[PDB]
Symmetry: D2
Subunit: 317 residues, 4 copies
């Protein structure tokens, strides 16, 4: 039987006897994602070039306006806004949403895949809504996922029931369930990181990569893939297995990816899919944030590959 | 003034007072590309998943059928077909087309960018058409380019007049001219290759990549990007500058990519854009093919980076 | 604030503290309508004509609505213009709603690219017996919701509920039904009449006189204009938007009319009344006819209340 | 073999060894039609209603701008412009185009079918272009047709070679040839006119319509259809046969429809499809216009139906 994003969420929502607020949020987010996809694919670009005589800004406005008007949110953190957005009182709901409206968009000049990353928390404090409400550890996530605007547009949604993948059918504007309760391979054959920072790597990453290229056990070397777009790289890791690394370097001593709306949502998808996500020192989902734009190093993917990196990381203290 | 691919090609055709066959060919190719894009973007996939109760094969059929019916071709070479396809006599025209209908589709499960690559030659002799008509050096190309099915769909077309980029507006099915007479940067800051197979690298490749990561002077190390999809990686190399490598080694002394419908059209785009493309021993465009599916090593991109690679390659000779 | 069909229905559902089955029903129907629209607009037709070297639309439309409604877990009995017997949903998929629909009305003239549409009406199953065709034989007064999709120059979904009539425009760039007209009301009196005058030779005498009054008014005021697309959803929607009267009346050759009560007349009558209009058979309210056959026909005269009242005055004159 | 509008026109053009200017105009017009269709189907309406926080005017701007930039036209007459538009010298070509960019749009509030009508003439003298170039009889038409934005979008193109019908495939933005060399039924069973104005009918129209409802030979009465959108009614008459009337009366002795960009293209299509088109006194195509916005009565459709009307018309002298 065919299933769609909206029908899937309503079914899970009724089974859990919730109030519907999360369904309203997710439905509003799904609508913004379809509008972002249409813009990312350049529908209407002919009018920009005069047939009748900014993308990440539009993406942010779509998510902001759809999430505000859902009556389901109270605090919104976006990569595009320096401060948390506090939803006006008459529109307030119980959820906190941290999102990257168009991740990878700096390299959109080359038509690199881009994506939207979102993470959903229940507002925890009973204080007046504030930026502090977004500073919860990833263990607290209620839902998380991403839309990948790749060769096709896919929405990956992770909840307590697990990870489900929905493909956008643009002929009808509906998200179709195509992969149910997805699990990552126990061990992969691809590693993914920007090897241009090889001069700045800590000894543990340098050694782990060496093992991938020159395995001591005479197994075949791993292949390398690195799109430079986190959603594309994490999604390939999810689909094919393997490992994705973005560790700290001299330009980024606390790492480069954002904890709140890049690392946590991806770590949540990984863990619900049976994978792993670590900073080297701890689980990404256990980091307690202090700043809404704070960065984190990240190594994630198949459990055997992350565990192997951790053994090497422990070798070097 | 707004411009479209068809209007552009017609304008050039009338300026050069040609017969129109080339315009008929490119218009047919453009129709196939729009239909490939629609399938790659998964339009109608809801019907596959039972809402009312192949991609590389379809892509090949779309290109094959539109070229045959264009009345502009006589010999069609495809990555998908063991032998050259001879157009039946009543449909015969004067061009030979070598194409990869869906490059990168082996990894299409992860929604990586895929693309269509094509190169157009004039049939040289008046003999009966045969495979031999496709064995021309890339120097003989009359037109070449690619469609990139990325975050947007773009057609990059190289002819004698230079390289022009057309963005597909999917709302109206028109390719809009958005970049005229593009030229690649003299020197880039990105190298692109599969470093997972470093254990098998030729010593020149090992040394060149080592220099990108560990510069001898005080310049910053290059970034690394490797999508694993030739069209995406080459297009990024075109737009941002840098170097793309799929070189020879002792295990594969002739490389992995195919000369007729991957290396030559990309080499041609590069050279019309002020770039370079070498096998290490000679310009890709100067190789005289002996088999329609023969392989070639390819190193292409910004001229300063390719010339520097040739310096290191010559060092180990 | 922008509103969409799914968001509008969820808000009303939450406001009424319902279980969610009707929203799951309407959302499943909304999906079928977007798929019908895409097919009606001939997306992918290049593949039928050999671009790479297949079904009838009304068959496909029926399959889309049937399959989406069955899998909604919200229905138990489905009556379709295309099917002789009601379909009884298998037990594991059963819900509490009965749906009567015409998946692609007007499709006979789709060769000329006339506007076509989807018509639906939703009932609560009344009895506690095991579901059967009987559950669809309720008068239109029992309708829980009704409406139609018009596949015209644009695709619009018109949804009528207790709260009234709302019009949603399909944005095909994103596949969303956008609320564009809230709480629509029909003009008290219009200036257009709509019927097939080619069959005037068979007119009931009351129809003949009423049309004569529209063309040759006794006071010598301006005549009404005439429009008849011949596709019920287009003509009824124009009546809602512009006012006036739409007639598919009875005659001696066809004493019960031609249009179908359960999935054409009742849903349209329900929309008209929620928009403050009228809909009569000549003898009684459409919504009050108690059906005995799921495919029984009904005469229908609907539109602005002053225009319908004037028709009835003439109809009563002719006993 | 599949065919498209652009490929079909290019083939007719090469066969006739023309210069390509007509093909350039028709391709430009085809681009404008797809943009009109896209706006008519309300693509992008969500942005008008605030998702991120006129139509006949746009239609004219689209047609005007694409024709101006086609370099194939010099004089453009539009229902939307009181005077002819003279194309500026550097963009000038040899054709005059009369068009109604979105006919029926006054009733677009109810989503009635609407359409674009066009007729293409060759410029008169080699002198300066002026309004006088649009004052040609329909017999001088080089090509004409209409786009119908109905349940689907179809373009009907009439030339000397006959009438061909192209369906817009919106998944790929291409017009697919679906009905070749169309001929209207010799006699139909439907008449089309606004019977609410019966009080103003000339006696011949009153008599002809009486015969449709109360046939003297006891054959079946005709059905009546009147959308009130000329393109929708005329297209039905072409496909199903029958007759469409917008005749002269005492209140409007020259009719209501416009001769240059409503009546003439439809008459040309009709005559090229083997039908007829009269004002009652003469063939529509033989009226020599004196004002670009002058009106003409029109009766068109199946020949047996038109001839029957003309016989009634002559009975009343
Ligand atoms: O949607 C909820 N209830 C509903 N009632 C009727 C309908 Br139709 S949906 N509840 S919820 O908390 O939003 C939720 C959403 C998704 C998954 C789990 C949960 Cl618990
Ligand atoms: O199309 C050609 N002539 C034309 N005449 C009328 C029209 Br309209 S197009 N000639 S061509 O060989 O196809 C060609 C195409 C592109 C660039 C150069 C060349 Cl030579
Ligand atoms: O959907 C319903 N509740 C919901 N709970 C959570 C969500 Br999210 S929606 N209820 S309902 O019966 O379907 C209904 C729909 C529309 C109008 C009235 C009614 Cl009562
Ligand atoms: O298109 C024309 N020539 C061409 N040569 C090569 C190409 Br590719 S198109 N000529 S034309 O005058 O525009 C014309 C168009 C359609 C039908 C008849 C005529 Cl004569």
């Amino acid at each position: 039987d065919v299933n769609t994003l909206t029908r899937f969420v309503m079914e899970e929502g009724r089974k859990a006897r919730g109030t519907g607020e999360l369904t309203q949020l997710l439905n509003s987010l799904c609508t913004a994602v379809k509008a972002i996809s249409s813009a990312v694919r350049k529908a209407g670009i002919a009018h920009l070039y005069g047939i009748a005589g900014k993308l990440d800004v539009l993406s942010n406005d779509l998510v902001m306006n759809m999430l505000k008007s859902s009556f389901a949110t109270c605090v919104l953190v976006s990569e595009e806004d320096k401060h948390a957005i506090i939803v006006e009182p008459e529109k307030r709901g119980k959820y906190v949403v941290c999102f990257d409206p168009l991740d990878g968009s700096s390299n959109i000049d080359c038509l690199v895949s881009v994506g939207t990353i979102f993470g959903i928390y229940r507002k925890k404090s009973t204080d007046e809504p504030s930026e502090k409400d977004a500073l919860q550890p990833g263990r607290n996530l209620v839902a998380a996922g991403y839309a990948l605007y790749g060769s096709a547009t896919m929405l990956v949604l992770a909840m307590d029931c697990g990870v489900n993948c929905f493909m956008l059918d643009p002929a009808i504007g509906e998200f179709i369930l195509v992969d149910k309760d997805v699990k990552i391979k126990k061990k992969g054959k691809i590693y993914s990181l920007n090897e241009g920072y090889a001069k700045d790597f800590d000894p543990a990453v340098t050694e782990y990569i060496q093992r991938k290229k020159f395995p001591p056990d005479n197994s075949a070397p791993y292949g390398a893939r690195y799109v430079g777009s986190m959603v594309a790289d994490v999604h390939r890791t999810l689909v094919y297995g393997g490992i994705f690394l973005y560790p700290a370097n001299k330009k980024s001593p606390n790492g480069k990816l954002r904890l709140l709306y890049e690392c946590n949502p991806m770590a949540y998808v990984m863990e619900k899919a049976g994978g792993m996500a670590t900073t080297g020192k701890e689980a990404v989902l256990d980091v307690i944030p202090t700043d809404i734009h704070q960065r984190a190093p990240v190594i994630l993917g198949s459990p055997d590959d992350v565990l192997e990196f951790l053994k090497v990381y422990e070798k070097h203290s």
